[PDB]
Write a protein that binds this ligand. Structure first.
Ligand SMILES: [Cl-]
Ligand SMILES: [Cl-]
Ligand code: NA
Length: 129
């Protein structure tokens, strides 16, 4: 599913990500935009052989199991495929554990390079929330 910008902001809010660990909603929407262009089915292989899955490109090196990332963990206790669902519940729940790990949203390199310090409020401008 390719979400619309405000449609995604509303589902993220509903699921409790608005200000989670201090990160306003626009930060999560901006991260999603650049990680997956709002597409729940997005996947991208990393150089180390791990793969990133879903709207928030959660990696199989630590967070989900895909059966093909040697020596990796599955800290969110889920098959990586659950992260590609039209229902963002699994992605959000897993994102909450990632962002709580010590480095906040810096865990998403695209958020650090393209969203951090910018006017992320723009990402939820005009949305009925
Ligand atoms: Cl594996
Ligand atoms: Cl933080
Ligand atoms: Na894994």
């Amino acid at each position: 599913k390719v979400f619309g910008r405000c449609e995604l902001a509303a589902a993220m809010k509903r699921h409790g990500l608005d200000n989670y660990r201090g990160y306003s909603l626009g930060n999560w929407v901006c991260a999603a935009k650049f990680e997956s262009n709002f597409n729940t089915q997005a996947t991208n292989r990393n150089t180390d052989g791990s793969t990133d899955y879903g709207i928030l490109q959660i990696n199989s090196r630590w967070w989900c199991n895909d059966g093909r990332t040697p020596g990796s963990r599955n800290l969110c206790n889920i098959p990586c495929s659950a992260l590609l669902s039209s229902d963002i519940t699994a992605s959000v729940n897993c994102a909450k554990k990632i962002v709580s790990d010590g480095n906040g949203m810096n865990a998403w390199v695209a958020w650090r390079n393209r969203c951090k310090g910018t006017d992320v409020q723009a990402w939820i401008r005009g949305c009925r929330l």
